Each structure stands twice: as structure tokens, then as C-alpha cells.
Design an enzyme around this catalytic site. Structure first.
Site, mmCIF file in Angstrom:
data_model
loop_
_atom_site.group_PDB
_atom_site.id
_atom_site.type_symbol
_atom_site.label_atom_id
_atom_site.label_comp_id
_atom_site.label_asym_id
_atom_site.label_seq_id
_atom_site.Cartn_x
_atom_site.Cartn_y
_atom_site.Cartn_z
ATOM 1 N N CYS A 34 3.193 -7.264 -5.273
ATOM 2 C CA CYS A 34 3.158 -5.802 -4.662
ATOM 3 C C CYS A 34 4.361 -5.441 -4.044
ATOM 4 C CB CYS A 34 1.979 -5.548 -3.559
ATOM 5 S SG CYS A 34 2.072 -4.052 -2.557
ATOM 6 N N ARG A 52 4.994 -3.787 0.106
ATOM 7 C CA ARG A 52 4.482 -4.522 1.353
ATOM 8 C C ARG A 52 5.008 -4.258 2.494
ATOM 9 N NH1 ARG A 52 4.915 -10.459 -0.406
ATOM 10 N NH2 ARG A 52 5.922 -9.811 -2.190
ATOM 11 N N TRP A 103 -0.769 4.475 -2.205
ATOM 12 C CA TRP A 103 -0.416 5.440 -2.884
ATOM 13 C C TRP A 103 0.381 4.822 -4.128
ATOM 14 C CZ3 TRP A 103 1.570 5.328 2.281
ATOM 15 C CH2 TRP A 103 2.673 4.648 2.561
ATOM 16 N N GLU A 126 4.043 3.512 -12.193
ATOM 17 C CA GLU A 126 2.511 2.941 -12.823
ATOM 18 C C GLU A 126 1.836 3.924 -13.704
ATOM 19 O OE1 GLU A 126 0.247 1.118 -9.306
ATOM 20 O OE2 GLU A 126 1.616 2.125 -8.299
HETATM 21 C C1 HEM Z 1 1.136 1.894 0.281
HETATM 22 C C2 HEM Z 1 1.516 2.136 -1.257
HETATM 23 C C3 HEM Z 1 1.671 0.978 -2.145
HETATM 24 C C4 HEM Z 1 2.408 1.008 -3.188
HETATM 25 C C5 HEM Z 1 3.368 2.040 -3.298
HETATM 26 C C6 HEM Z 1 2.078 -0.078 -3.771
HETATM 27 C C7 HEM Z 1 2.783 -0.757 -4.946
HETATM 28 C C8 HEM Z 1 2.148 -1.434 -5.879
HETATM 29 C C9 HEM Z 1 2.443 -1.695 -7.229
HETATM 30 C C10 HEM Z 1 3.364 -0.755 -8.187
HETATM 31 C C11 HEM Z 1 1.843 -2.720 -7.772
HETATM 32 C C12 HEM Z 1 1.784 -3.124 -9.634
HETATM 33 C C13 HEM Z 1 0.512 -2.559 -9.908
HETATM 34 C C14 HEM Z 1 0.168 -3.062 -11.650
HETATM 35 O O1 HEM Z 1 1.203 -2.784 -12.195
HETATM 36 O O2 HEM Z 1 -0.837 -3.093 -11.925
HETATM 37 C C15 HEM Z 1 1.155 -3.234 -6.896
HETATM 38 C C16 HEM Z 1 0.271 -4.267 -6.996
HETATM 39 C C17 HEM Z 1 -0.570 -4.959 -5.876
HETATM 40 N N1 HEM Z 1 -0.634 -4.254 -4.645
HETATM 41 FE FE1 HEM Z 1 0.101 -2.875 -4.008
HETATM 42 N N2 HEM Z 1 1.108 -0.856 -3.399
HETATM 43 C C18 HEM Z 1 0.779 -0.318 -2.271
HETATM 44 C C19 HEM Z 1 -0.344 -0.629 -1.203
HETATM 45 C C20 HEM Z 1 -1.262 -1.691 -1.338
HETATM 46 C C21 HEM Z 1 -2.161 -2.294 -0.649
HETATM 47 C C22 HEM Z 1 -2.750 -1.232 0.736
HETATM 48 C C23 HEM Z 1 -2.708 -3.423 -0.705
HETATM 49 C C24 HEM Z 1 -3.663 -4.503 -0.370
HETATM 50 C C25 HEM Z 1 -4.273 -3.904 0.955
HETATM 51 C C26 HEM Z 1 -2.006 -3.793 -2.026
HETATM 52 C C27 HEM Z 1 -2.016 -4.870 -2.647
HETATM 53 C C28 HEM Z 1 -1.729 -5.038 -3.823
HETATM 54 C C29 HEM Z 1 -1.898 -6.137 -4.918
HETATM 55 C C30 HEM Z 1 -3.074 -7.134 -4.628
HETATM 56 C C31 HEM Z 1 -1.479 -5.919 -6.053
HETATM 57 C C32 HEM Z 1 -1.751 -6.988 -7.205
HETATM 58 C C33 HEM Z 1 -2.966 -6.255 -8.034
HETATM 59 C C34 HEM Z 1 -3.105 -7.112 -9.493
HETATM 60 O O3 HEM Z 1 -2.682 -8.237 -9.793
HETATM 61 O O4 HEM Z 1 -3.583 -6.267 -10.535
HETATM 62 N N3 HEM Z 1 -0.907 -2.786 -2.383
HETATM 63 N N4 HEM Z 1 1.382 -2.496 -5.629
HETATM 64 C C1 LIG Z 2 -3.562 -0.822 -3.813
HETATM 65 C C2 LIG Z 2 -2.826 -0.467 -5.009
HETATM 66 C C3 LIG Z 2 -1.580 0.668 -4.936
HETATM 67 C C4 LIG Z 2 -0.799 0.867 -5.958
HETATM 68 N N1 LIG Z 2 0.013 1.618 -5.798
HETATM 69 N N2 LIG Z 2 -1.060 0.283 -7.349
HETATM 70 C C5 LIG Z 2 -2.400 -0.354 -7.540
HETATM 71 C C6 LIG Z 2 -2.754 -0.949 -8.731
HETATM 72 C C7 LIG Z 2 -3.148 0.160 -9.911
HETATM 73 C C8 LIG Z 2 -3.625 -0.762 -10.912
HETATM 74 C C9 LIG Z 2 -4.903 -1.519 -10.658
HETATM 75 N N3 LIG Z 2 -5.549 -2.249 -11.453
HETATM 76 C C10 LIG Z 2 -4.899 -2.476 -12.653
HETATM 77 C C11 LIG Z 2 -3.819 -1.909 -13.179
HETATM 78 C C12 LIG Z 2 -3.596 -2.272 -14.434
HETATM 79 C C13 LIG Z 2 -4.008 -3.584 -14.564
HETATM 80 N N4 LIG Z 2 -3.987 -4.570 -15.744
HETATM 81 C C14 LIG Z 2 -3.209 -5.579 -15.485
HETATM 82 C C15 LIG Z 2 -5.237 -4.945 -15.943
HETATM 83 C C16 LIG Z 2 -3.262 -0.731 -12.285
HETATM 84 C C17 LIG Z 2 -2.997 -0.819 -6.127
HETATM 85 CL CL LIG Z 3 -3.581 2.522 -12.169
#
Ligand code: HEM
Ligand SMILES: Cc1cc(N)nc(CCc2cncc(CCN(C)C)c2)c1
Ligand SMILES: [Cl-]
Ligand code: HEM
Ligand SMILES: Cc1cc(N)nc(CCc2cncc(CCN(C)C)c2)c1
Ligand SMILES: C[C@H](O)[C@H](O)[C@H]1CNc2nc(N)[nH]c(=O)c2N1
Ligand SMILES: C[C@H](O)[C@H](O)[C@H]1CNc2nc(N)[nH]c(=O)c2N1
Ligand SMILES: [Cl-]
Lengths: 362, 362
Positions: free
Chosen positions: B65, B68, B237, B242
Site C-alpha cells: 500500500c 500508508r 480513496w 488503479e
Molecule cells: C487512503 C487512501 C488509500 C490509497 C490512496 C491507497 C492506495 C493503494 C493502492 C494504489 C493499492 C494497490 C491496489 C491494487 O493494485 O490492487 C493499495 C493496496 C492496499 N492497501 Fe491501500 N490505499 C489507501 C488506504 C488504505 C487503507 C485505509 C487500508 C487498510 C486499512 C489499506 C490497505 C491496503 C492493502 C492491504 C493493500 C493490498 C491489497 C491487495 O493485496 O490486494 N489501504 N493501496
Molecule cells: C483500501 C484500498 C484503497 C485503494 N486505493 N485501493 C484498494 C484496492 C483496489 C483493489 C482491491 N482489490 C483488488 C484489486 C484488483 C486485485 N487483483 C490483484 C485481484 C484492486 C484498496
Molecule cells: Cl479496484
């Protein structure tokens, strides 16, 4: 100790090399001669066939290279016979000329005598045979920042750059027995350069950008069957992103994105406008257009990735494991538009291969 | 065996959590109560403070992420009190409403009762609470291919999609003791969607693209001090890429690059024209423009990377090790224009954290 390591590397290499060449029946005898040669001499000498196939295998095994589909057509020039700095210089000039091939670039490697007791016979200081100088002094940045340390070493040896943004560094190398390296100015007639213009935007030429035709890495070590060829420059043709997304774009290189944005007529004020991304796309289009217009070989990152997919397919067909460094294989623009982004690679080191070595400057 | 693992995880967590909260003197006593609770019950129950800080730590530790920096302002909703499917449904509706916040998105997590004997109390089938259905049958692709398997499971349970490219999947979850999950149609009034238009190119609206406002991941497990919250949906958000570089661009998703190229008036015939790259930049500009015009929170990848740099700086300032997954942190367009591309990260797993779990469909 060292002859144990050598002999073991030799066995693994000769066995594999001869398998690939359809000559497995000759392994035992060749291995016999090598065992004696090592015992009696402390080392062994590759046949022209072994050296050639070894260099090709080393390219095939280079994890960070997207261009490996063409590994088997590498042009290998055997210069293990050189003994003088004049011969080294002329071999380097020759490499530039033959690899350039009037624009239709030939992937080539020139192999100089290998280390003996780990003692280098020739040591090339250049990072690439053709590269631009860089200067930094009292606020002033000129040329390629990546070349600052080598540029300063060259000027310690009596060379002086004109201090344009594109001074060609001289060839600089050291012979065994000599305390200092010698340097030689590159003949301009040998070096193809490409002015950067844009297919649609006439003002792009106002940036007065250019780049050289052929990337010739000259400071890596080729290791083949326990033998260390520390001096063995090699080249391919460029993938456009190397120039457009990195050399001309990085803040720590030529840093041209703001100037690109201005000439393509977009504002460079707001991150949300994605002006850096737009400028990168236009700069990269200009690079590809310019090389093609001048008849100098280049590949775009989409085509290169398609070729690399074929390399993967051929590895599996030949029953060879594929190795790769995902972090280097993905292109620096639109990586997710390539298949590379969506799979993973085993980053194990397989030999023969090319390796980094310490810089004698710095 | 299990109470050993639990107790050990509890000691590590409580110690660290209370340090961070300035309550280290209360550790011994709290640890005492937990030891007894485990012995007597087989488990232990987090205080509201522990649960809240645990969810925040889990976000802070999420290697993939980029967002963070804002870990400490996570809005934690404690719903460990729910016992009925109506309560679960209403809690999920509430999460959507409060996180959406009329467009000014609030990062939120809703935490449902944790596993007991590893027995789930509630099991959410949705991948995100808001997501589009996908269909494939006899040559015909409709909607989001990533949703095909869940869409088919839903239609096995009596739901029927309208078969537009953007059908909202129903909420679908299963309660302990029930053989099948139940499903509930999402009230449209709860779901903000953003039509995609381009700031300069009026024809862009002809593509009739849209996306939903809030990504709410609902199928990961939150682990805090040995306690497994398998049902704990969370949202942030969006980062624009994405949607623009992946959801709408991937060949295995909505696959819109060829159509984008056409509406922006460029040919999609030659790799060397970099039409995919140009189309990606324009689509990503359109996404950011559209969300901002509608007053829905979004971040561009440059700003997000700048924020992540601050997260790195704060980790070192607080004396905490930084962990990260380079392959996920780099944005899928212009990655080398971010600092992330040019450094490396330790991809070690630190707990509390969020984890994948097996899908009950498939
Ligand atoms: C506040 C705005 C946030 C932004 C802009 C952001 C941004 C992102 C982005 C761009 C990804 C990659 C997603 C993908 O390619 O599928 C991601 C993954 C992730 N984010 Fe964040 N995030 C945010 C908030 C959060 C919050 C609030 C949490 C948890 C409390 C979180 C936990 C994670 C986790 C666990 C992943 C990995 C998910 C996976 O493996 O599919 N994020 N985040
Ligand atoms: C919390 C949060 C914030 C943010 N900006 N984006 C996401 C994830 C969006 C998202 C969630 N889950 C799967 C995909 C594609 C996943 N593939 C790898 C299976 C995208 C999650
Ligand atoms: Cl998504
Ligand atoms: C034929 C055209 C070729 C193309 C298009 C190509 C493409 C590339 C690219 C884009 C890189 C990344 C460079 C960087 O980011 O610094 C690279 C790295 C590399 N290539 Fe190739 N390559 C080609 C030929 C060759 C040849 C002929 C060899 C050796 C015989 C070779 C060996 C390598 C090695 C060793 C690296 C890694 C260098 C490093 O770590 O700095 N390549 N290649
Ligand atoms: C053989 C070859 C082909 C090709 N297309 N490109 C290169 C490398 C160009 C190149 C060579 N050496 C350093 C940099 C920048 C290196 N940084 C990481 C130090 C770039 C080499
Ligand atoms: C195989 C490879 O790791 C895979 O394509 C990853 C790469 N990086 C990614 N990064 C993000 N943010 N999201 C993804 O889905 C992926 N996919
Ligand atoms: C730290 C990080 O690994 C570094 O930026 C790498 C990433 N991938 C790369 N890939 C290529 N082809 N060339 C590079 O110089 C780099 N730099
Ligand atoms: Cl280069």
C-alpha cells in the site's frame, strides 16, 4: 584451491556447452586436456567455439536484459591476441565501427585476454565505449551527471572537455604493468548520433537534444567456465525507453521533462494534469521517430516485450529454466501494458554470465 | 498448542501497542488478565483501544500500500456486537455511507466478530463491497471479467444481473450455522459513481465509461495479536492509476485502450507510435479530472508517491523499520518518475496486518 574452483567450473561449462553444440562425445577428451592444462599451467584456454558459445550463453543468462531473444546471433570477436595499447585502441575503434554497421546495428562483443592470477591484462575504465561527459562545479551542471566521476578522472590525466552538454568521453583503459591508464579521443566519424525531433511537433527541435546510436557496455566482466574476461565490451541496439524515459528524463540525468512540457505546449504546474506522464510519452515517441528516420536500429518497449515473450517460449521449448529480474525487465513507461508486469521471474544467477566489477576511479 | 501461539502473539502485540500509546506501565496487568482469559476461555477479547490501534498498525504494515502516510487517522468501527444477518447487512450499508461521506471519502474499517475455534462468525463473499458483475458465455464478454466467478455464484443463489457492463453485485455473506450465504441488492442511493469525461476532448464521453467512488476491500483477514478478524472490510480513496491504468485498461479487465485511442483521434496500428502509452495517459487524466469535478476524493500517483516518501521519513523518525513490496508500490504508469522506483524495500511481513484468504466460491 583456485585450480579446484577453476576445474569444477570448467567441468560444468564444457559439459553444458558441448551438449548444446551437439558434441557431447568430445567432452571426456576435452575435459582430459583441460585437467592437465590446469595442473601444469594453473589455467586453461578456451577454443574459439567455446568462447563464442560462452558469450552467447552469458547473454542468454543475463537476468536484467529484455533483449535476450537474439542471444544466438551475437557476433563474437576474439581479441585474446592483443598485447599493446595501440592494438587495444584499434580493437575498440573496430568494435564501434562494426557494431554500428552504418546504422543497422549488429549485437557484438569483443573479448580481450582474461585475468591470469586474477591479474588483469587490460582494464577498461569507460562505462560504455561511447558516453557523454558530465561536470559539476559551483552551482553549474553540464552534460551527463552519471559521468561526473569518470570525467574528473579523465581530466586528471590531461584530457580537457569542451563543456558542451554532449562531450564524447575519450576511450580510457590501463594495460598490465602500467601505473596509469592511457586515453584516446574518439574519432567523430566513428560515432553515429541522432538529433531528437518529434513527428508532429516542430518546436521539439528547439530542445537541441541528441543521443548516440550504440550502447556499448565496457566495464562488466564476462565469466565463462571459471575464466574471467574482465575486459569484454558488448552492445545491442537501444530500447527507446532507455533514452527517453531514463537518460533524458531522470532528475539525476539530463532532467528534460519540464522543458519537454513547455515545447509540447502543456502546463507543468499540477500533478493531477499528469504533465510528466504526457511529456514522457511525447519524448519517447520523438526518440523512436528520430532513430528510425536516421536509419539507426532501435526497438520500442512493446515490441521488445513481445520478443521477450518469445524468448520465454523458446526456453521452455528447449527445456531450459528461465531466469529474470522483474524489476529490470518491466519497461519504465506503461509497464502494465506488457505481459512482463503480470508474471514473476526466478532471479537466480546462472553462469556463464556478465557481472559488475569495482570501478578503478572512485 | 493454539493457546500457546495465541498467548505469544498477544504478548508481542500488547507490549508494542501499549508502548506506542504511552501506556507501557499497564502491560503487565493487562497481560495477566489475558493469560487467565486464554486459559479459562481459549481466547481473549481486545479493548476498543487495542482493536483500533491494531487496525491502524495493520494498515501501517501493509507492504503493498502506497497510501500508508495516513495510517493513524483510520476510522475504526467496532461491530463485534452483531449476531444477525440483518445487522451485518445494515453495518455494511452504514460503512458504505459513512466512508463515502458525500464524496469526501473517510478511510474506514468495520470490524465484525473474529473467528472462534477458527470458526468464522460471518464470512463476506464480496471482493469489494462495491464492484461490477462480469459475464462470459458463448463468445460474449459483458462487465468486469474479474467478477465472473463471484457473479456466477450469485446467480446460483437466485440473483440475476441486468447484464449491463456495470451491474452492481449484491452484498453476499454467510453467517455461522447457515449452509448458504444470503444476498442483498445495494441501494443505488448509497453508491456514488463517476462518469468519465476528459478535460479537453469532448468525444471522450462517447465511451460511456464510469467507475464507483470508493474501493472497499471486503475479503481480507485482519490479524491482531493472534486474533483473526476474517470479516473486516476497509476502504481508502482511489489512486487514479488503479482505475485508469488497470481496471479500465487491462486486457483481462475492461480493455478500453483501443477505444480510447480512437476517441482521442490517434491511430492504433504501430507499436512505435506508442499509442497505448498515449491512450493510457489520456485515460488517466480523464479519471482524475472526472473524480475531482464530481467532488469525489482521489489522488494522482505523483502526489501519492510524495506522501509515501513522507511515510518513509516518519518511520525512520519514529525508529520503526519500513517494510514494502516494490513490485506493488511502483505505479503502473511512469514509475521511474517516482522516488519509489529508484530505491529498494524490505518485503518482510510484520503483524498486525491484512492477509489474503481462500474464496468460498471457486
Ligand atoms: C487512503 C487512501 C488509500 C490509497 C490512496 C491507497 C492506495 C493503494 C493502492 C494504489 C493499492 C494497490 C491496489 C491494487 O493494485 O490492487 C493499495 C493496496 C492496499 N492497501 Fe491501500 N490505499 C489507501 C488506504 C488504505 C487503507 C485505509 C487500508 C487498510 C486499512 C489499506 C490497505 C491496503 C492493502 C492491504 C493493500 C493490498 C491489497 C491487495 O493485496 O490486494 N489501504 N493501496
Ligand atoms: C483500501 C484500498 C484503497 C485503494 N486505493 N485501493 C484498494 C484496492 C483496489 C483493489 C482491491 N482489490 C483488488 C484489486 C484488483 C486485485 N487483483 C490483484 C485481484 C484492486 C484498496
Ligand atoms: Cl479496484
Ligand atoms: C540486441 C538488442 C538489445 C536490447 C534491445 C537490450 C535491452 C536491454 C535493456 C533495455 C537493458 C536495461 C538497461 C538499463 O536499464 O540500464 C538491458 C540490460 C542488459 N543487457 Fe541487454 N539488450 C540488448 C542486447 C544485449 C547484448 C548483446 C548483451 C550482451 C551480450 C546484453 C546484456 C545485457 C546486460 C548484461 C544487461 C544488464 C546491464 C546492467 O546491469 O547494467 N544485452 N538490455
Ligand atoms: C548491451 C546493451 C543493450 C542495451 N539496449 N542497453 C544497454 C545498457 C545501456 C546502459 C548501460 N549501462 C548503464 C546504464 C545506466 C546504468 N545505471 C544503472 C548505472 C544504461 C546495454
Ligand atoms: C506478477 C506481478 O507481481 C503482478 O503483475 C503485480 C505487479 N505489481 C502490481 N502492483 C499493484 N499495485 N497491483 C497489482 O495488481 C500488481 N500486479
Ligand atoms: C532500486 C530499483 O531496483 C532501481 O530503480 C532499478 C529499478 N529497475 C530498473 N530497471 C532498469 N531496466 N534499469 C534501471 O536502472 C532500474 N533501476
Ligand atoms: Cl544508456
Amino acid at each position: 584451491e583456485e585450480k579446484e574452483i577453476l576445474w569444477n567450473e570448467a567441468k560444468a561449462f564444457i559439459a553444458a556447452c558441448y551438449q548444446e553444440l551437439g558434441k557431447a562425445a568430445e567432452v571426456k577428451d576435452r575435459l582430459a586436456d583441460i585437467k592437465s592444462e590446469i595442473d601444469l599451467t594453473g589455467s586453461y584456454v578456451h577454443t574459439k567455439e567455446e568462447l563464442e558459445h560462452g558469450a552467447k550463453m552469458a547473454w542468454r543468462n543475463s537476468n536484467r536484459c529484455i533483449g535476450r531473444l537474439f542471444w544466438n546471433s551475437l557476433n563474437v570477436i576474439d581479441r585474446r591476441d592483443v598485447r599493446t595499447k595501440e592494438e587495444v585502441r584499434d580493437a575498440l575503434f573496430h568494435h564501434i565501427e562494426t557494431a554500428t554497421n552504418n546504422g543497422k546495428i549488429r549485437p557484438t562483443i569483443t573479448i580481450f585476454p582474461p585475468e591470469e592470477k586474477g591479474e588483469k591484462q587490460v582494464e577498461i575504465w569507460n562505462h560504455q565505449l561511447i558516453r557523454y561527459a558530465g561536470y559539476e562545479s559551483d552551482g553549474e551542471r553540464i552534460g551527463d551527471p552519471a559521468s561526473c566521476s569518470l570525467t574528473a578522472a579523465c581530466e586528471e590525466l590531461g584530457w580537457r572537455g569542451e563543456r558542451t552538454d554532449f562531450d564524447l568521453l575519450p576511450l580510457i583503459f590501463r594495460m598490465k604493468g602500467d601505473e596509469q591508464p592511457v586515453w584516446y579521443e574518439l574519432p567523430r566519424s566513428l560515432v553515429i548520433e541522432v538529433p531528437i525531433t518529434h513527428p508532429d511537433i516542430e518546436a521539439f527541435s528547439d530542445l537541441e537534444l541528441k543521443w548516440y546510436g550504440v550502447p556499448i557496455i565496457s566495464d562488466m566482466k564476462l565469466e565463462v567456465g571459471g575464466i574471467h574476461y574482465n575486459a569484454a565490451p558488448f552492445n545491442g541496439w537501444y530500447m527507446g525507453t532507455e533514452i527517453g524515459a531514463r537518460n533524458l528524463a531522470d532528475e539525476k540525468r539530463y532532467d528534460k521533462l519540464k522543458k519537454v512540457a513547455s515545447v509540447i505546449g502543456i502546463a507543468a504546474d499540477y500533478n493531477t494534469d499528469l504533465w510528466k506522464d504526457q511529456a514522457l510519452v511525447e519524448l519517447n515517441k520523438a526518440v523512436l521517430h528520430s532513430y528510425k528516420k536516421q536509419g539507426v536500429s532501435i526497438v520500442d518497449h512493446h515490441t521488445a516485450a513481445s520478443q521477450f515473450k518469445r524468448f520465454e517460449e523458446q526456453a521452455e521449448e528447449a527445456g531450459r529454466k528461465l531466469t529474470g529480474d522483474w524489476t529490470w525487465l518491466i519497461p519504465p513507461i506503461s509497464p502494465a501494458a506488457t505481459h512482463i508486469f503480470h508474471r514473476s521471474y526466478d532471479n537466480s544467477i546462472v553462469k556463464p554470465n556478465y557481472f559488475y566489477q569495482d570501478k578503478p576511479y572512485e
